[PDB]
Curated annotation (Swiss-Prot):
Present with 7330 molecules/cell in log phase SD medium. Heme c binds at C19, C22, H23, M85. This is Cytochrome c isoform 1. Binds 1 heme c group covalently per subunit. Belongs to the cytochrome c family. Methylation may enhance its transport into mitochondria. Methylation occurs in fungi, plants, and some protozoa, but not in animals. The precise role of methylation at Lys-78 is unknown, but it seems to preclude pro-apoptotic activity, possibly by lowering affinity for APAF1. Electron carrier protein. The oxidized form of the cytochrome c heme group can accept an electron from the heme group of the cytochrome c1 subunit of ubiquinol-cytochrome c oxidoreductase. Cytochrome c then transfers this electron to the dinuclear copper A center (CU(A)) of the COX2 subunit of cytochrome oxidase, the final protein carrier in the mitochondrial electron-transport chain. Isoform 1 (CYC1) is the predominant cytochrome c during aerobic/normoxic growth. Its main location: mitochondrion. Induction: By oxygen at the level of transcription. Expression drops rapidly when the oxygen concentration falls below 0.5 uM O(2). The modification N6,N6,N6-trimethyllysine is found at K77, K78. It comes from Saccharomyces cerevisiae (strain ATCC 204508 / S288c). Gene3D superfamilies: Cytochrome c-like domain.
């Protein structure tokens, strides 16, 4: 994909309604169905401490950045075949840009 910085204020609303059910962003934050996302950018996949991932998410070994995250969030199951989740993706590019703008700051 091709990320363009958007609205982190809209990104925070999108995280609450589309991600927060399964994830947290705070340092030391708890894992829910999905892993806590603190430090996700600039780190390889399957490395949230204390979270047990599928072989698919571990074997992907993607170094998370703004662009591959955008591609991933479009359809996680297409990007990482074998990943297990009741999530189909964030289809609108504007949403992905807004979400990632917020996420880059929230997980820092
Ligand atoms: C529950 C229905 C979920 C929603 C909604 C979202 N995600 Fe998720 N995510 C979930 C699980 C169970 C997992 C782990 C899957 C596995 O194969 O083990 C994940 C994983 C991620 C990751 C990868 C983390 C890593 O360390 O590699 C990211 C980056 C991620 N999820 C982000 C994310 C965002 C931003 C969401 C809202 C757009 C979101 N997920 C929705 C479960 C669920």
């Amino acid at each position: 994909a091709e990320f363009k910085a958007g609205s982190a204020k809209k990104g925070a609303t999108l995280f609450k309604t589309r991600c927060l059910q399964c994830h947290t962003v705070e340092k030391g934050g708890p894992h829910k169905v999905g892993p806590n996302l603190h430090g996700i950018f600039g780190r390889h996949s399957g490395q949230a401490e204390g979270y047990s991932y599928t072989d698919a998410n571990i074997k992907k070994n993607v170094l998370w950045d703004e662009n591959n995250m955008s591609e991933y969030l479009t359809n996680p199951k297409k990007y990482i075949p074998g990943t297990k989740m009741a999530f189909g993706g964030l289809k609108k590019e504007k949403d992905r840009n807004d979400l990632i703008t917020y996420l880059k700051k929230a997980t820092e």
